[PDB]
């Protein structure tokens, strides 16, 4: 028998990188042009926002298996 | 899909006023400063200036200080212009542009009886 | 305000030939937060502008590599390393580093065929 679980992490580390790419171009959209202070920290919070998304779509899929 | 969107024309009289609209979606509506854009007919580019859309603080150049109002409606992500006591001077295209590079397509404003 | 003046204020180039156009203004760009907010934008005739160049020398969102942005301070350079028939149009050079933001004149770019 092979791991059912192990397909769950298969998508990871590829979805966790689009995330982070989007938040440094948000960043760099903040950067092009004045800008209220806060408009970096808002990507940031979409960020962080995605992961936990993510992190529980994980948890999700492992127990649909265990 | 960072999308501005103004309506292609408005028609209004001498005297009278106007509310520009520019209404955004796929990105945060709050987090980018606004500017607004004036050109003339075969002219040059004139910044009128710019919103907050998070706080509704504005920055105005001067030349307009008594023709353009600046406002946002956080509720349906649209920013606002207002532009008072309209005279033929006042005929032009009018852009909404999120920073430098995301531009609406531009309201082309008539004066006209 | 800052007045942006750009030369030459026309350009005929033939296709595969380099093009440069020049910004200087009557200011320094260079911010009190160490950036320099020049920008480049082109506008093609009956379209809205687009932005080529921000913060003096960074390629924005579309831009091939043929265009090039240098300078620092009062002068700034945009350069063509080869022309080709869809470059033509207005070039304008943008700061929003003082209030209010103000234009360059522009510069047309036609194409000799």
């Known amino acids: 028998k092979y791991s059912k679980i192990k397909e769950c992490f298969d998508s990871l580390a590829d979805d966790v990188k689009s995330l982070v790419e989007k938040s440094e171009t948000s960043y760099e959209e903040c950067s092009k042009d004045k800008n209220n202070p806060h408009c970096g920290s808002e990507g940031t919070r979409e960020l962080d926002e995605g992961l936990i998304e993510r992190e529980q779509k994980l948890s999700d899929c492992i127990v649909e298996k265990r | 899909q960072v999308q501005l969107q103004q309506p292609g024309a408005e028609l209004v009289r001498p005297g009278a006023s106007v509310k520009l609209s520019c209404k955004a979606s796929?990105?945060?509506?709050?987090?980018?400063?606004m500017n607004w854009v004036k050109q003339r007919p075969g002219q040059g580019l004139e910044w009128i200036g710019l919103?907050?859309?998070?706080?509704?603080?504005?920055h105005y150049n001067q030349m307009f200080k008594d023709k353009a109002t600046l406002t946002v409606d956080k509720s349906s992500s649209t920013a606002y212009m207002q532009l008072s006591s309209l005279t033929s001077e006042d005929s032009a295209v009018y852009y909404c542009?999120?920073?430098?590079?995301?531009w609406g397509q531009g309201t082309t404003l008539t004066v006209s009886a | 305000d800052v007045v942006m003046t750009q030369t030459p204020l026309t350009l005929s180039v033939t296709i595969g030939q380099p093009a440069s156009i020049a910004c200087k203004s009557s200011?320094?760009?260079?911010?009190?937060?160490?950036?320099?907010?020049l920008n480049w934008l082109l506008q093609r005739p009956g379209q809205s502008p687009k932005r080529l160049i921000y913060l003096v020398s960074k390629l924005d969102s579309g831009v091939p590599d043929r265009f090039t942005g240098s300078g620092s301070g009062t002068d700034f350079t945009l350069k063509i390393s080869r022309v080709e028939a869809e470059d033509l149009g207005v070039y304008y050079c943008?700061?929003?580093?003082?209030?209010?933001?103000?234009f360059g004149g522009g510069t047309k770019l036609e194409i000799k065929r």
């Open positions: 542009a999120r920073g430098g590079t995301y």
């Open positions: 200011q320094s760009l260079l911010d009190s937060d160490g950036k320099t907010y």
């Open positions: 919103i907050d859309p998070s706080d509704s603080e504005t």
């Open positions: 796929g990105y945060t509506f709050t987090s980018y400063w």
């Open positions: 943008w700061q929003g580093t003082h209030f209010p933001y103000t």
